[PDB]
Amino acid sequence: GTPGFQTPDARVISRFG
Amino acid sequence: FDAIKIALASPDMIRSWSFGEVKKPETINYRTFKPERDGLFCARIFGPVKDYECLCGKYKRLKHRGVICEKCGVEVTQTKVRRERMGHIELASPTAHIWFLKSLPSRIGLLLDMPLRDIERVLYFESYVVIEGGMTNLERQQILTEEQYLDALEEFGDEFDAKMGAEAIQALLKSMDLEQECEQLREELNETNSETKRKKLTKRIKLLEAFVQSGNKPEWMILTVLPVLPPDLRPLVPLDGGRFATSDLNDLYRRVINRNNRLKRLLDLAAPDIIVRNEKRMLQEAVDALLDNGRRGRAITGSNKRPLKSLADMIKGKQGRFRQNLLGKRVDYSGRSVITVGPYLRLHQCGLPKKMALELFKPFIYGKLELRGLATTIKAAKKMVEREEAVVWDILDEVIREHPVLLNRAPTLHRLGIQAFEPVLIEGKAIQLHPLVCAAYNADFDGDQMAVHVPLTLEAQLEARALMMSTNNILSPANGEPIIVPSQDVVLGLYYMTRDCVNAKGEGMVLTGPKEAERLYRSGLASLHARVKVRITEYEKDANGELVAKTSLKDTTVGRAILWMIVPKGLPYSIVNQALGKKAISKMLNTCYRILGLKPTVIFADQIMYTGFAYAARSGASVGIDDMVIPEKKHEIISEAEAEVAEIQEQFQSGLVTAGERYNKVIDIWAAANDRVSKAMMDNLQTETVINRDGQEEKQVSFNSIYMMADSGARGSAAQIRQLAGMRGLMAKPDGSIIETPITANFREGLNVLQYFISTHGARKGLADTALKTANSGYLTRRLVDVAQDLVVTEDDCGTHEGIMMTPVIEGGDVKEPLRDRVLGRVTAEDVLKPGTADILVPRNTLLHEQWCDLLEENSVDAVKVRSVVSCDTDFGVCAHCYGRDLARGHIINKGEAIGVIAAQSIGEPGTQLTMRTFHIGSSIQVKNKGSIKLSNVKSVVNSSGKLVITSRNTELKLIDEFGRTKESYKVPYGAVLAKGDGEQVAGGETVANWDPHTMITGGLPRVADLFEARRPKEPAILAEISGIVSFGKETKGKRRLVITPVDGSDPYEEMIPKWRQLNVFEGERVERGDVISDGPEAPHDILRLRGVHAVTRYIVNEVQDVYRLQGVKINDKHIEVIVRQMLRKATIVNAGSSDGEQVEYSRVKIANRELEANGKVGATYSRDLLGITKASLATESFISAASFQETTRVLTEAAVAGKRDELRGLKENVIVGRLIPAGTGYAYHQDRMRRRAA
């Protein structure tokens, strides 16, 4: 949900999936 | 003084400063170390080495000061004068100034409209040049080589003069008649078209007339006499032990002197040309390396591959003078140390070590000790404080009392990075910091260090109490939300208190009041989570502002009743009856502030902290290895998905699916299985706890520790839990961005080597992105502050109804941000009427605080025209009205408050929370909410099917619900399938939109940098220039042709487009100005020109808000609007009006044109010019301010030839000279001082 970027959530990769 | 001016230095004016001529490149004796005669350190030229003492020593005392001893020619004065005494060297041959030649706009270059290359060629003594030809075969200016000049002298011995070298360039500048030449270029600009005749002409004329205006002469481009820097500016001071330390300036000057002396000697010695020409070039090289080293050859210091730093290098850059010294300095009365928690502090105080207090307040302590007869003289008090006598400690208590100190966190993103506290003396060497402020500083107790500053003057002590006090700043300026909010343990304790569980001891009983609830828990009789109902007396002030208390019994818990005792009098107790985690401890604080005010809210937050810490302490709230409960289903789910991938494996090995098809297949099934696993553990956690109600089972929300931490918001969220107790999704490489083999294990089971190695891939990009982003975010915020500084609130009201139309951001199905949030705090441009037209909901212009927002929210209103900063009738600043309200205080913005700096900070502080790259992942329309279809700007027609079809490209789909508000916004392309039409009633999702699929940045922080710089996109979209059916061109020649076809009058406009670019516009259809003939990303210049100022100022904010909305960042549009205003401050006239293609400031064009339009004279038409932040900052009235920020060399050279003048009229230039900045208190002082000046 928020560019992390380690894993994706919905639209982008994220810090926490 | 009151101003600064910069101009060319004439040779006589150069000698004026000098007090002597340097003849020999010697510094000191080498056995006496005394300054040699005529050396760079000569005491006769500059001054004595020692204070009030003569070099020969014959004249020794203050008895006689003004006298020049005939012995050594020294005058006995203050040695500090060696800091101010200049000198001069008499150059044997003229030498050109590098800045006036190598700078981008070569002064000598377009001063004679000669090319730079040819001047460089002439200087190297590689060719001749003619001067003052008169009646000659050749011109007045020309170039010829050795053979050509050889036989040229016999033609005309007289009337023909051709020199070579710097003398030639100088003489060409001297006999040059600027007025005569100028008086021609004018006509060369008038008759002849073909802008090539207008490219440099329109700038060369400017250069000529500015050169004449300044009064300086062109011959001064070539330095006849070389000024020298005082010796104390380049000391040879002994570095102990032993070795001496000199400045590279000294080596450069030594070289220059050696070469000038050798040239003189050769002149007298009568040497041939080649030698003396080589010597002239050596002298030019030495001079240019002394002024600005590196542009030509980068001369080096001996014993090093390091170049010697020259003069120009001691000014420009982050290092050097301007950035590193004048705008920032190391400061006395300051300290540094490690910060740690003391919660016992109030919000207005902080624990300060006694050891630091003694050193910092040393002068105060000395004076106070000498005042009370405790010390005979100042030395005695020094020795006392040095001896650590007991009596001094009390004195310390006396001097620290009510003396604020400024605390600063190392990185300063926004103004809250510095806040003042009331010192509380403590032992030890650690500084105690208040927890509530840690959110403002963005500081943890993991080893971070903070600095302290002691205000000296009484005025600073008042500014640290009324302005920078910790309690006077609670809510952020970027957004109204309070930055002072319980963080981790406070909210955890409160959530533990307000929690309720069925069947708790004493549940259902009744208590007299909250005191009895406390007495019942602390006695071990009743628990804290019981569902007990008690009597509470809540206070409500109503109907005339008169407090009326209310008594009743409520459905509550023991813990909530205990928590009610801290709540201030005026709150309603509905705030205390819920789970009570962080997210609405925040809203409780906000409502308390905006109802009761600052004073109640401060102590309210203090009490919240005091109670939450102790309650979370006595609650235990630990974490064990059993607290993370994995779902027993996880095994089966993992096995099922694992098997699911085998079918895909068989699919690809055959060819039934491609490689990419199968990869996407596998990744999708694994993501869905991860969803399943996380959902399983979450359903086993949230409803985990089940117990017996009155003796029978029932399931309720769980008391699990980690889950409580997630739910309260004190710490890690659900995404953390999914990896804590379930398969931790699947990782991503730097790019490729997702791997097919996910992480089956959860952190509790433990990772195996392969999965951990896979995880490190995504771990690295995360760590690395933060480090290098730190460097670029600083650059961004620095440019932002540079483009904004001088903008200050200067007027009460502008008197314009223009403003901007504020409408909710209803994107797609629902709203991203309601209208209340985009309107609150601002002022209406015109009277909002009730939805029933012709009424008055709000007057013409008023500040919309929360009450008007609620009133609007009740009535059906999503339309409010809000006055904005961009459109404002104010000059050199902004008026309080149009800007709107904002502060830690919630009233209308004050006057003199510098809002540009705070806006740059509001945009820069979140810049560190952004990212460097995005890497996104992801067809009829379906309306969600029940309402009424409302079409916007659509032309339609009926066809065979009988329904309606769209004939226009642009067609918005709004929804007028049962209330009347618009929560739906959808765009439908040409030729749609309309089921209802405009003004129909839809069911709970009737589909009225249908069409076909075909008919046939980074982004992040770099994106924000791109938007504020107005950078042209890669493949821009172009825009129509006027209404009318479009027309095609001849054929594909290079790209293509496109003919504009205006409908009625002037219809000659045109443009050319590549046929490789696809087209979207309709052929025989009318298309208004600012329409998309071609799909693509839009550019700010195009939007501004084809739509207007408000359209572009809305585009910038709406686009730059998406990147900040993606990340959890919330900032009011006001700061972005002020930045946008600062961007478009330039404009270009069209008709030349009454008085003189030019580019000038909008405010000046108005002050010149509107006042004369009043006078009945002709009007002047301008054209808004859009510039980036760095480019708009490049143009500034003050040349000091510009030379500080960037490009010192070029700015200073241009301002030198211009003879420009600076009255400093601003912030940066005022801090440079150390004066009161014209804002805040400085504004109050400057107002009185300037009122009496120039009048």
Partner: protein, 49 residues
Amino acid sequence: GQNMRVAFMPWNGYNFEDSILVSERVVQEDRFTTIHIQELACVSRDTKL
């Protein structure tokens, strides 16, 4: 380092962000005490005087 008996629980905000609440016994027993050594030299060299 040293073996410490740790207990996971908040304590009056004395471990609010990452702060560490340490018992007085630990500092009593000198088990975290560190012995440092500093070298500082006085240099007598020739001067003009």
